[PDB]
Design a binder for this molecule. Structure first.
Ligand SMILES: C/C=C(\C)CC/C=C(\C)CC/C=C(\C)CCC=C(C)C
Length: 433
């Protein structure tokens, strides 16, 4: 196999982040070379099919029992994550036009864990007044809070109600409406989607806007604010590969990167199969540049096949479940996202619940018991522990732009920030929406 002599950009790995940036570059008029050492797409975030392959990958010789249904009807994302309907990730996908090859379907339910139980996340005043997460009085205070958020307008100080969006902290905003720890817990982690409570002592603007984003997405799609493509996220690598051909430049799989040639601290090309191709910029995931990354931790994901909808979700065919750390004596949230035959990722009557979190103990599996208890009985489990990496070089000089490994969250918030960041580092300016 052979490469060209020169490309403006060379991308290594076909993970979601690489694919999306690769799409932007191509659409922006650059000659792109995109390759992957693997014989499949998505790298770490690959989708597995048929079911038999999933069993193989997890060392389950027995193979799936007939009761698992038609193997070919299974498309299992190793790292499933949902997209915020009105989010920027979706907007970036529209920009590349890869959306032309995707069928987004709204996730049926969104829940939050509390006191050992899961409740519907209340985003509307109506949902608030009917929520069992709070008592009669507090839920009414929360209702007024949502009112303020809904009516809030960044450019109209009359709606600020005396708060300084650029200076008044969210903690102060919470006090203003007299909201307790439990309400703050699900609002911050299940509505604003933060991973930690650092936002409490930061300007309220961002948080208010995040809650607005959730509400607006929900209002637009009805069931929840989350989207997931039919057939799983594996449809993205395929879409971008197809988009790639359009602008000339087909994705090359099963192609080894023998070396990343650096000249005076700056990349100038890549060598593969006794051949060299020059490039001005290089995009890749951590696995291609061990010396330009540091380990930021470990994540554990447990894929659980079920034959029944998750209890207490009103038989949702798909759902997001956030388990705030404070609710389970942890320093990191636990997540559970589930998709099923409704999104064409599993055989009829089957559901795929994937529980995840950041490792904090020597018994990672035990750490996720709080989430598994919400899923039993479980037909089969698939446990995977992954090391997380983040670049120690922003490519400013090297012109080598590495992405971060995918964290435990079950939505694209943090992945979107990485993409936007990497892009800014490459273009010199922020992606203009
Ligand atoms: C006010 C500045 C804005 C809105 C910047 C964002 C620019 C966009 C959304 C379009 C400019 C790009 C083109 C005219 C051509 C590239 C082709 C595609 C993105 C299909």
């Amino acid at each position: 196999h052979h490469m060209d002599e020169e490309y403006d950009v060379i991308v290594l790995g076909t993970g979601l982040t690489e694919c999306i940036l690769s799409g932007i570059m191509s659409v922006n008029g650059k000659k792109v070379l995109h390759m992957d050492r693997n014989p499949y797409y998505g790298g770490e975030s690959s989708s597995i099919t048929p079911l038999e392959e999933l069993y193989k990958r997890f060392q389950l010789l027995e193979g799936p029992p007939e009761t698992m249904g038609r193997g070919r009807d299974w498309n299992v994302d190793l790292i499933p994550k949902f997209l915020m309907a009105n989010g920027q990730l979706v907007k970036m996908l529209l920009y590349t036009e890869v959306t032309r090859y995707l069928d987004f379907k709204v996730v049926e339910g969104s829940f939050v864990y509390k006191g050992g139980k899961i409740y519907k996340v209340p985003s509307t005043e109506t949902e608030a007044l009917a929520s069992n997460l709070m008592g009669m009085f507090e839920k009414r205070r929360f209702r007024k809070f949502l009112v303020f958020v809904a009516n809030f307008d960044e450019n109209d100080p009359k709606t600020f109600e005396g708060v300084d969006p650029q200076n008044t902290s969210m903690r102060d905003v919470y006090r203003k409406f007299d909201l307790g720890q439990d309400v703050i817990d699900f609002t911050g982690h299940a509505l604003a989607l933060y991973r930690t409570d650092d936002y409490l002592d930061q300007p309220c603007l961002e948080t208010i806007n995040r809650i607005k984003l959730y509400s607006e997405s929900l209002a637009r799609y009805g069931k929840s604010p989350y989207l997931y493509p039919l057939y799983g996220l594996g449809e993205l690598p395929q879409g971008f590969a197809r988009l790639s051909a359009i602008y000339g430049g087909t994705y090359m799989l099963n192609k080894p990167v023998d070396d990343i040639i650096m000249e005076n601290g700056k990349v100038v090309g890549v060598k593969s199969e006794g051949e060299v191709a020059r490039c001005k910029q290089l995009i890749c995931d951590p696995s291609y540049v061990p010396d330009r990354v540091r380990k930021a931790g470990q994540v554990i994901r447990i894929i659980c096949i079920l034959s029944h909808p998750i209890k207490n979700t009103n038989d949702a065919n798909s759902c997001q479940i956030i388990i705030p750390q404070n609710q389970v004596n942890r320093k990191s949230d636990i997540y559970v996202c589930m998709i099923s035959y409704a999104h064409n990722v599993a055989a009829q009557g089957k559901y795929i619940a994937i529980a995840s979190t950041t490792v904090e103990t020597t018994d990672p599996e035990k750490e996720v018991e709080p989430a598994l208890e919400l899923l039993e009985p479980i037909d089969q489990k698939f446990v995977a522990i992954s090391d997380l990496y983040e670049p120690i070089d922003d490519g400013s000089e090297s012109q080598v732009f590495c992405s971060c490994s995918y964290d435990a969250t079950t939505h694209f918030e943090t992945t979107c920030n990485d993409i936007k960041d990497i892009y800014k580092r490459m273009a010199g300016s922020a992606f203009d929406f």
